[PDB]
């Protein structure tokens, strides 16, 4: 194992200064990463892997054999959120956060919308198979339940399907922040599910603070997505580019916001909306504390700008 470095992207989104406040290891907080699976025994990931499920071919399996990453993409995305802060490898935005790896994409990085919708359902239900065990309508942030507080989707498709949207709506109403990659086609608007009102679409910047030419336009926020070093199978590391790499930076920042807020107040923040510019919701906080690059204000390249964890968390706690 190599000695630890902090990848440039982790620095860019101002994560390291947050860690004295929280690294995301607040027990009610989990981030569900719907992707190609995870190298669950990776020395720089293993301790943060709280649940490993697969929904491939429409059957929910919790076997390690089935939830294992056969591609590498999921392991990479998870590492950017939650690689451990220690002596080796890299370090995530929220290096103590619990991860649910939900495998919805196969060995070649393709997935059916059905498997993705089943994946979202699993992130709401959690290990116990029940959304809201005590019937109080509180799901994300309820310490009695085991629902994820963030759903991270480094994937996209052109189709807008009513059932998939229904599932997105269920996650939103559970209080779960949904984050998704804007897409890699240099298109005028995000792919689905990023394009849904309830979901934070994430574009990619490079290490010069330029938007990546491939990044689909009109995102909500942007984040590091070119030359991103993270964990990769088997027990190794790799450098990749894509809106899939930007996404986990934002999910990580959300995890820090919600962890910090629960640590202080015993509740989580509401998800919020695209238009929100208050300090009263997760998305409002993300928008107002983002580094506003390009033209003043929200623009079609950067959205509201580059997320910054340090300021986000201060806005949450202030």
């Amino acid at each position: 194992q190599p000695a630890q470095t902090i990848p440039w992207g982790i620095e860019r989104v101002k994560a390291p200064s947050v860690w004295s406040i929280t690294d995301g290891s607040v027990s009610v907080i989990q981030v569900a990463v719907l992707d190609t699976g995870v190298d669950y025994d990776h020395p720089d990931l293993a301790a943060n892997i709280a649940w490993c499920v697969s929904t491939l071919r429409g059957k929910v399996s919790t076997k390690l054999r089935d939830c294992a990453d056969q591609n590498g993409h999921g392991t990479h995305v998870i590492g950017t959120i939650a690689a451990l802060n220690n002596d080796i490898g890299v370090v995530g935005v929220a290096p103590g956060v619990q991860i649910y790896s939900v495998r919805v994409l196969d060995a070649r990085g393709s997935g059916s919308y059905s498997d993705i919708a089943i994946g979202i359902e699993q992130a709401i239900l959690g290990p116990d198979g029940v959304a809201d065990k005590d019937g109080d309508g509180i799901i994300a942030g309820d310490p009695d339940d085991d629902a994820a507080e963030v759903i991270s989707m480094s994937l996209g498709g052109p189709a807008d399907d009513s059932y998939l949207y229904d599932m997105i709506i269920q996650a939103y109403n559970a209080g779960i922040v949904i984050v998704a990659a804007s897409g890699n086609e240099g298109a005028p608007s995000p792919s689905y599910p990023a394009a849904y009102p309830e979901v934070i679409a994430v574009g990619a910047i490079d290490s010069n603070d330029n938007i990546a030419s491939f990044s689909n336009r009109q995102p909500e926020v942007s984040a590091p997505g070119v030359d991103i070093l993270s964990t990769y199978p088997d027990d190794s590391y790799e450098t990749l580019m894509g809106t899939a790499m930007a996404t986990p930076h934002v999910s990580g920042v959300v995890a820090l916001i919600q962890a910090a807020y629960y640590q202080k107040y015993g509740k989580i923040l509401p998800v919020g909306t695209f238009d929100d510019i208050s300090k009263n919701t997760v998305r409002g906080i993300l928008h107002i504390t983002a580094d506003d690059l390009g033209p003043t204000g929200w623009d079609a390249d950067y959205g509201y700008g580059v997320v910054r964890a340090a300021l986000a968390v201060q806005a949450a706690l202030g």
């Binding site: 994409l105 359902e121 059932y163 792919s191």
Partner: protein
């Protein structure tokens, strides 16, 4: 044989009516009123015709980004 997703109210869907048209249930959602099924290509129109069926949707593809 194709995989489709049928939108249908929990209380008015019987899993047993899809065998009749040559299909079988793949996954019944716990949190939305829908069911994933495998059916012969010719069965798609039949599903639509059912009064209880609000929508039949093809199983689309996403890719890693």
């Amino acid at each position: 044989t194709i995989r489709v997703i049928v939108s249908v109210d929990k209380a008015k869907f019987n899993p047993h009516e899809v065998l009749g048209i040559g299909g079988h249930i793949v996954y019944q959602f716990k949190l939305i009123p829908a069911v994933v099924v495998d059916v012969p290509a010719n069965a798609v129109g039949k599903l639509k015709k059912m009064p209880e069926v609000e929508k039949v949707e093809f199983d689309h593809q996403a890719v890693l980004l």
